[PDB]
Write a protein that binds this ligand. Structure first.
Ligand SMILES: [K+]
Ligand SMILES: [Mg+2]
Ligand SMILES: [Mg+2]
Ligand SMILES: [Mg+2]
Ligand SMILES: [Mg+2]
Ligand SMILES: [Mg+2]
Ligand SMILES: [Mg+2]
Ligand SMILES: [Mg+2]
Length: 187
RNA sequence: CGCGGUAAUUCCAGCUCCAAUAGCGUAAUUUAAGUUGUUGCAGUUAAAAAGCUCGUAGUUGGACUUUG
């Protein structure tokens, strides 16, 4: 039944790491009374490790879009329970989204704006900094040719994200390929 | 543009000198003309903003969708 917590696209076989994440997810469903009720409906569809720095790993778990709103209500508590099981790792939930390529020249086919690459990358960035809310964005175009984005986070949720700023920057570059640094505006 | 009204560098002549030269002078059009201006002109007082507003055609129209 631990494989009923994973629905990989195309009914593909979960890898050796997804089963560990799924198996760890099943345990919290029954062991933790607080999360008993909520975790029943929730399920994931992928999971991967990303190296951050200093032999540190980050568990990036993708979630069905329809369930992206249910995880938020139990995001703060669930991450605490999964991080202890996955010692020395940070858990990040990102809803799955499709990126439809722009139509060719003179094509009648339409494309919803949410399926655009820019709209998806911005949406991934918002799901990456949960529970922190973005309050500003800056993009600096360096003379050499590279560009770096600076994201301002609400200082209210600073205790739950101050230690993850390195994981956010590393996780976002692999999913988007863009440099990002997070900062808290003075208040 | 001006010269000539009794001491004319300007007219009529001689001399001398100058330019082009087997050629040179005189009587539509291009250049000069950014004096027709697309490149590229003007409109306070020199020529030139309609007394004022609406308004169709015309002309002109913010940003955003695949990057790395
Ligand atoms: K010119
Ligand atoms: Mg005489
Ligand atoms: Mg003369
Ligand atoms: Mg004229
Ligand atoms: Mg003029
Ligand atoms: Mg007058
Ligand atoms: Mg006048
Ligand atoms: Mg436009």
């Amino acid at each position: 039944t631990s494989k009923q917590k994973i629905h990989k696209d195309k009914a593909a076989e979960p890898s050796e790491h997804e089963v560990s994440v799924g198996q760890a997810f099943f345990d919290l469903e029954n062991t933790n009374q607080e999360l008993k009720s909520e975790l029943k409906d929730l399920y994931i569809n992928s999971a991967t490790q990303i190296d951050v720095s200093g032999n540190r790993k980050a568990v990036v778990i993708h979630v069905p879009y329809r369930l992206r709103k249910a995880f938020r209500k139990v995001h703060v508590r669930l991450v605490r329970e999964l991080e202890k099981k996955f010692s020395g790792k940070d858990v990040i939930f990102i809803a799955t989204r499709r990126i439809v390529r722009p139509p060719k020249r003179g094509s009648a086919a339409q494309r919803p704006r949410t399926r655009t690459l820019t709209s998806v990358h911005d949406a991934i960035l918002e799901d990456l900094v949960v529970p922190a809310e973005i309050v500003g964005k800056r993009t600096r175009y360096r003379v050499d040719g590279s560009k770096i984005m600076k994201v301002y986070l609400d200082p209210k949720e600073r205790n739950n994200t101050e230690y993850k700023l390195e994981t956010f920057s590393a996780v976002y570059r692999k999913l988007s390929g863009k440099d990002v640094v997070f900062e808290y505006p003075i208040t």
